[PDB]
Each structure stands twice: as structure tokens, then as C-alpha cells.
Amino acid sequence: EELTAEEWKRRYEKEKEKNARLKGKVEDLEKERDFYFGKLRNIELICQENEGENDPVLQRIVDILYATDEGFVIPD
Amino acid sequence: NEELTAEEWKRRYEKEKEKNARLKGKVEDLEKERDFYFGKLRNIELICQENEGENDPVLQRIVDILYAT
């Protein structure tokens, strides 16, 4: 059956509310993502600062830092 | 005049639906990135904990990073 103006309006409004919620969620996740990335960069800096120490535990941390999303350690 | 027609509301609905499909893609991408970085930090925290019986100051700075708000 063919929808009325009111029925399309209700669908539009439902989507608009959804849109506001998604914007809030994407902005929250963006913030948390950058937060964690900043931590990781700071830890990378601490490691580099202490690289003249050839510490194996620091090397384990570096390997965690450089693991790809496929699970392989590739520096940079 | 002032009231929108069925076709005009339909158009707005379709445009908003398309926007929401895009935002859902972005949410899921960001969720994956977030989990990726969070998992690295949890791994690093573990390495620091395994090694706390060293009183290494540098590990303490890393832990300070980990717990900063």
C-alpha cells in the first residue's frame, strides 16, 4: 500500500533520531581511539628514548607496538 | 504552501537512511581501530606487570602513560 505523508514523516524522524545517536557514538569512539593512539605514541617515544639500553623487555613492548592487524611485527 | 508532500518526506527519509548507512560504516571502522589500540595497551600493561620485580623506572613511566586519564 502507498504510504501517506505522515507515515513517511515518521520514518524520516526515526532516521533523524538514529542519526543524532550515531554521530554521538562515532565522535565518542573517535575520541577514545585518538586517546589510545596518543598513549601508544608516548610509549613509543619512551622506548626510543631508552633504546641505548638494549633492554629485552622494552623490545617485547616495541614488538607489540609494531604488530599489524594481521598479527605480524613490522616496524614503522 | 507550508506542509511537505508525501514525496518530499520520502526523499528526506531516503537521504537520512543513506547518511545512517555511512555513519554505521564509520562506527564499525572506528570500533575496530579502538579495539586494536586498546588490545596493544593491554598487552603492554601485561609485559610491565610480568616485570614489576625490577623497579625499572622506565617501565614505571610506561605504566604512568597507561593509567593517565
> In A, which residues are within 8 Å of B40 by CB distance?
36, 40, 64-65, 67
The answer to whether B26 touches A19, Cβ cutoff 8 Å, is no
Question: How far apart (Å, rounded) are the C-alpha atoms in residues A75 and A25?
Answer: 32
A3/B5 Cβ within 8 A: no
What region does B35 belong to: left with phi over 0, alpha with psi -120 to 50, or beta? alpha
Which of A6, A36, A63, A74 should one mutate to test binding to chain B, selecting the residue with the greatest count of B CBs within 10 A? A36
Cell 607496538 appears where?
A65
Residue of B nearest to A70 (CA): B36
> Is A41 at the interface with chain B, CB within 8 A?
no
Of B19, B27, B44, the CB nearest to A29: B27
Distance from CA of B2 to the nearest CA of A (A): 13
Domains of chain A: 5-65 (1.20.5.1430)
The method of structure determination was: X-ray
Across the strands, what pairs with A73? Answer: A67
DSSP collapsed to 3 states, B25-69: HHHHHHHHHHHHHHHHHHHHHHHHHHCHHHCCHHHHHHHHHHHCC
Question: How far apart (Å, rounded) are the C-alpha atoms in residues B21 and A22?
Answer: 10
> Of A20, A24, A31, which is closest to residue B16 (Cα–Cα)?
A20
